[PDB]
Amino acid sequence: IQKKLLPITKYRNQLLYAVEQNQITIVLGHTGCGKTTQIPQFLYEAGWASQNGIIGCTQPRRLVAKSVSERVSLELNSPPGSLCGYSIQFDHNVSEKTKIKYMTDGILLNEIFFDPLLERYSIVILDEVHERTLSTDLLLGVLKRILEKRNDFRLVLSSASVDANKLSQFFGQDKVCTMSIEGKLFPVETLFLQKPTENYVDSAIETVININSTYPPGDILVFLSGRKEIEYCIKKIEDSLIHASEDCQTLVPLPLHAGLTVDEQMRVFNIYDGDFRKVIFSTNIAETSITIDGIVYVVDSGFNKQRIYNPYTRTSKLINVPISKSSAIQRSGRAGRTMRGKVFRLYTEKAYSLMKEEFEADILNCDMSPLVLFLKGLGLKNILQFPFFVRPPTVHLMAALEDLYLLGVLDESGNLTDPLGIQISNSFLDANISKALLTSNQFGCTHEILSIASILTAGEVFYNPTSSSKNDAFVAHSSFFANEGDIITALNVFESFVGNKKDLQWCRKNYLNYQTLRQALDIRTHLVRFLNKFSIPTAQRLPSSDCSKILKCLLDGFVRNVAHLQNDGSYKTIGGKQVWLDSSSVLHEKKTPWIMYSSAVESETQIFVKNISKIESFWLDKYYKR
Amino acid sequence: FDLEPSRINQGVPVWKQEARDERNRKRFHGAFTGGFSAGYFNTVGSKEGWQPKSWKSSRNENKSVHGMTIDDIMDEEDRADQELSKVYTSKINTIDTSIPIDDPLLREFSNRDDSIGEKMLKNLGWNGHDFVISPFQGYYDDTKLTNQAYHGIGYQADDVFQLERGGFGSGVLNDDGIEDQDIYDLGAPKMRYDKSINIT
Amino acid sequence: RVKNKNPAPIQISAEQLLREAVERQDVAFVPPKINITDLEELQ
Amino acid sequence: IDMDEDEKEMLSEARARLANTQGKKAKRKDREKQLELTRRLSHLQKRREL
Amino acid sequence: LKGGAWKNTEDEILKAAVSKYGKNQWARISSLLVRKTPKQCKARWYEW
RNA sequence: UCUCUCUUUGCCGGCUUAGAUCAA
């Protein structure tokens, strides 16, 4: 019944006709209208998956992929995984009988790498391509090529942004139809300031207070730059509650950002009975995949935080940028789902006249070193031959290529060097981390490096409470403080983690993130299969306590990321960069003479390093001399 | 060595951290570390003592009398700072890093620091003639523009409100003031001075 | 909902503070009395 | 009714402060007397068990 | 940070601290209230 | 005159520049 209520039912015949008669179809629509969930059902009913055919619909988000797969399996009244399944990066839950497949972009790139022509799929629908992920756009570039070779293969493009004309030019107008669905949205009136604001949160708090006292009940969703102002708004909203008048509703503030624990992110969905008005202080999470109902009034600051990587310094910084035009329309239209709502963007239309229309792709805002490995593995000598939708900056490509050359994966001619280069190309991870695993075979200690890599890719394995439990967390970790750095501390924690019977109460007691450890287990299992692809045994352990050769492999893996202490308390990277140690690391003030890190995060004044591990100079000298 | 009990630090950053304790005691040691005692106990010697080893030279017995080495005469501070003071070589890192080349003027005069990378571009068949740039570089300009200062989008700001020799030290606790600047001044020649002024 | 801004029916008073602070005291420390079983410890 | 939670912390500290009295380093002498009493009791108990 | 609006608990702790300490030990009284300064405690006592 | 209880019941560390200072 819910299938039939969606607006997409009335386009079924038209969508099928366009998809069949056109090699590539561009579908424009709003999230939640049924494009994500009902297009697979519609073409399965048409018969696209008939006779061994498979429906591979790409969902670039792992959680979204799994959730949509489960929803489609349940909506078709079929056992999970039988007809519809999900395949996310380093986690496979599929079956031979599965017809509707929701898959991640990286695995699909790997399948292209092994199978250049995708003979097992007759149709693939690209969904949620609006986020412009690196993997998504690389997949689009390769997919134009496969449509070039394959006349039977069909493409359906679903996007929440108006990019069809550029895609139409890129794909050729004679083979793409630009169709737009006519949804329904309650009319939303925009309100703009006559003069530019000086302090947008103070402008925001003024409007938030004015909405409560003068407008009918309804939750107000705000848009703020980042998580630092969220608590600031909590404090003023609490003070306003203390001084609230009898004519104003009890206004509850609710944070919503990426760094929260899931339960905190579940706190927002709670229903507050009585005269309680929710206000969600969301940075940018309440923009996609969030469907909180009852949102009426939205005040938009026009600023959003994002990430930029610096190739010259190999750093990454969180900077504030004015939002794009598309984001402004999405923010205005978010309010008004259930009833009429108004938006208050804290700037003037003259300010709107100047922002750039659409945010740049992550293929243009991420690390391209994994991308070059992909093209070189496919066999593309000249990177310029690949059909990029937007030309990536050449200097970034050159930074990645010089990094790969000094890494040894590329020769003087720029081609993959020895089995090392191809084996690195076969690895999902970055070339830097994979080198330690691949060189561990010469030394018979792959296991501890495998655990290190799994911990690094899975993420942070320690939990730091914000309450008084910080001392308790510190004491719980106090048993496993390694003199040699966090990396061997992580190794000890990983070794003893499996030694405590996978007890979840033990993980809680020791403030250890069990989820990260499980994900590391899946990563290491898949990398074991990856090494066995090269017939490398994975029973190799070092029986001796000397972690020195593990450190040789790591220094071979983090050649560039070394630094030594300066008198001023900072460290000089080998590349002449002034960095400061992060407070989280154990070796905060030990004044270790020589240090080695993995990742660098840069703030407006200090460049901070993570994953701190001590080293000795003569190892570096002997490694550099050869 | 048990790294001492680490729970003592907890949070409480620098300006409330008690004092450094060499042996869990509040006391400095060393002449240049703030202690009123240096050496063993204001002395050169050690607890056990020190004796030279026996010497015998007969063109075959001095062969057992080898030479002297760096480590055999240093102590733990000296070795620690010997490890700290070792910085050299580098080479390969310096050749392929930093700023290779950009903008047409620099291509002509400034040497391409890319070097072997120019041959790599030969592998890519660059053939750029006129170079190609991407809007990320306009965002790379944002690395040299601002990070915003909590202001609105349309806020024009103001121009009056933006702002940005040696010897021994007066003492790290003795602070700075009008007293501690260079009385001998010849800096800021012209960057702070205009070249012309409107007369009307 | 831990947002009961409603003023408390029992407001905190100073005399309450001093009373409940003093309440931390207990009876005088009771030591087990020494038993003089012979003459020398009596001496 | 629940005036957050840091106020409870400061209230507890204030309650401990207002009735603490007895100076600051007068806590050493009474403790030393208690320890001497314990040690003399142990000596006497050892003598009687002998 | 510092300052605020002098919640009733703060006022009551101020009254008790003046009971126990006196009117000439405002720093010692303000040690009880983390969120307030000796000048602020003296100002409230002499103004409200 | 005993016993218990209550009530009346006059009652039994110093000095100095507050010694000097104080942000999670």
Side-chain-side CA neighbours of residue A32 (13 Å): 11
Q: Are A285 and A26 in contact, with CB atoms under 8 Å apart? A: no
* B11 CB-to-strand F distance under 7 Å: yes
Shortest CA gap D12–chain C (Å): 9
Asked if B147 lies within 8 A of A320 by C-beta distance, the reply is yes
DSSP type of residue A185 = -
Across B136-169, b (16+ Cβ under 10 Å) vs e yields beebbebbeeeebebbbbbbeeeeeeeeeeeeee
Our measurement of CA D20 to C1' F5, in angstroms, reads 37
Which chains share 3+ C-beta pairs under 8 angstroms with A? B, C
Give the DSSP per-residue string, A40-96.
HHHHHHHTTT-SS--EEEE-SSHHHHHHHHHHHHHHTT--TTTSEEEEETTEEE--T
A225 three-state secondary structure: coil
| Rounded CA separation A447/A437 (Å) | 9
Tokens linked to A16: 């099928």
- Tokens 């593990």 belong to residue: A550
| Helix H or strand E segment including A213 | helix A200-214
Chain D residues in contact with E7 by the CB 8 A cut-off are 3, 7
Report the C-alpha gap between A606 and A580 in whole angstroms: 6
Neighbours of chain C (3+ CB pairs under 8 A): A, D, E
F18 C1': nearest CA residue: E24
Cβ pairs A/C, distance under 8 A: 9
Give A328: exposed, middle or buried? Use CB within 10 Å, 0-12, 13-18, 19+.
buried
> Hey, which residues 3-22 in chain E have their CB within 8 Å of chain D?
7, 9, 13, 16-17, 20
Burial category of A442 from C-beta neighbours within 10 Å (exposed 0-12, middle 13-18, buried 19 and up): exposed
**Nearest-5° Cα angle at A413, A411 to A416:** 45
Write a three-state SS string for A303-330. EEEEEEEECCCCEEEEEEEECCHHHHHH
Cβ contact E8 with chain F strand, < 7 A: no
Q: Count contacts between C and E (CB, < 8 Å).
A: 15
Q: Which residue has the tokens 């300064």?
A: E37
Nearest residue on chain C to A253, alpha-carbon basis: C3
Report phi then psi at A255, rounded to 5: -70, 155
The nucleotide closest to E37 (CA, C1' atoms): F23
Chain C hits for E12, Cβ within 8 Å: 12-14, 17
Question: Any known ligand binding at A29?
Answer: yes
B136–A364 CB contact, under 8 Å = yes
The pair of structure tokens assigned to A516 is 């990260």
Q: Describe the crossing of helices A514-533 and A486-498 by its angle, rounded to 10 degrees.
A: 90
Cβ neighbours of residue A232 closer than 8 Å, sequence gap 6 or more: A201
Out of C12, C17, C18, closest to residue E8 by CB: C12
- Give the tokens for residue A459: 């993420």
Method: cryo-EM
Q: Does residue A341 have a known ligand-binding role? A: no
Chains D and C touch (3+ CB pairs under 8 A): yes
Residue A49: how many other CB atoms lie within 10 Å: 22
Q: How many other CB atoms sit within 10 Å of the CB of residue A497? A: 22
Count Cβ atoms below 10 Å from residue B29 Cβ, excluding itself: 15
Q: Which residues pair with A303 in a beta bridge?
A: A322
Which B residues 144-173 have CB within 7 Å of strand F? none
Q: How many CA atoms lie within 13 A of A237 on its CB side?
A: 27
Pick A593's closest partner by Cβ from B80, B96, B125: B80
Residues of E within 8 A of D5 (CB-CB) are none
* A420 within 8 A of A427, measured Cβ to Cβ: no
Question: E strand or H helix at A282, and its extent?
Answer: strand A276-282
Complete edge-to-edge strand list for the sheet that includes strand A571-573: A303-310, A315-322, A599-602, A607-610, A578-581, A571-573, A562-565, A594-596, A613-614
Residues A35 and B85: their CA atoms lie apart, in Å, by 64
Nearest CA in chain D to E29: D14
Measured to protein CB atoms, the chain F nucleotides within 7 Å are 18, 21-24
Measured CA to C1', what is the nucleotide nearest E28? F22
What subunits touch chain B, counting only 3 or more CB pairs under 8 A?
A: A
Q: Are A161 and A70 in contact (CB under 8 A)?
A: no
Closest approach of E25 to chain D, Cα-based (Å) = 14
Cβ D11–E32 below 8 Å, yes or no?
no
C-alpha A233/C-alpha A253 separation (Å) is 8
- Using CA atoms, how far apart are residues A486 and A480, in angstroms rounded to an integer? 10
Contact flag, residue B13 CB and nucleic strand F, below 7 A = yes
d(CA B14, CA B176): 20
- Is residue E35's beta carbon less than 7 angstroms from any atom in nucleic acid strand F? no
Task: Give burial (CB, 10 Å; 0-12/13-18/19+) of A253.
Answer: buried
| E27 strand F contact, CB < 7 Å | yes
DSSP B159: S
DSSP letter, residue B39? B
Instruction: For residue E42, say whether its CB is under 7 Å from any atom of strand F.
Output: no
What are A102's strand-pairing partners?
Answer: A57, A86
Most B-contacting residue of A313, A317, A381, A398 (CB-CB within 10 A), to test interface: A398
The reply to whether A444 sits in an annotated binding site is no
Least Cα distance to A178 among A169, A168, A170, A189 occurs for A168
Q: What is the DSSP letter of A189?
A: E
CA A553 → C1' F23, Å? 47
User: Can chain C be said to touch chain A, i.e. do they have 3 or more Cβ pairs within 8 angstroms?
Assistant: yes
User: Beta-strand (E) ranges in A132-256?
Assistant: 154-159, 176-180, 189-192, 219-223, 250-256
The shortest C-alpha distance from E31 to chain D (Å) reads: 9
Do E33 and D17 count as a contact with CB atoms less than 8 A apart?
no
Residues of C at the E interface (Cβ-Cβ below 8 Å)? 11-14, 17-18
Q: Which helix (H) or strand (E) holds E41?
A: helix E38-47
Interchain contact D15–E (C-beta under 8 A): no
Rounded to a whole number of angstroms, the distance from the CA of D8 to the nearest CA of chain E is 10
Q: Which of residues 17-46 of D touch E (CB under 8 A)?
A: 17-18
Cα B99-B104-B105 angle, rounded to 5 deg: 85
Q: Which residues pair with A578 in a beta bridge?
A: A572
What's the CA–C1' distance between B188 and F8, in Å? 94
Please give, rounded to a whole number of angstroms, the shortest distance from the CA of E20 to a CA of chain C: 9
Please name the nucleotide lying closest to E2, CA to C1'. F23
Element (H, E) at A27: strand A24-28
Give me the half-sphere count of Cα atoms (radius 13 Å) on the Cβ side of residue A288: 14
- Does B contact D via 3+ CB–CB distances below 8 Å? no
Closest CA to A585 of A504, A507, A498, A489: A489
CA–CA distance, B80 with A587 (Å, rounded to integer):
16
Helices (H), A440-587: 446-458, 469-477, 486-498, 504-509, 514-533, 548-557
Is A178 among the annotated ligand-binding positions? no
Determine whether the annotation assigns residue A313 to a binding site: no
- Of all protein residues, which has its CA closest to the C1' atom of F22? E27
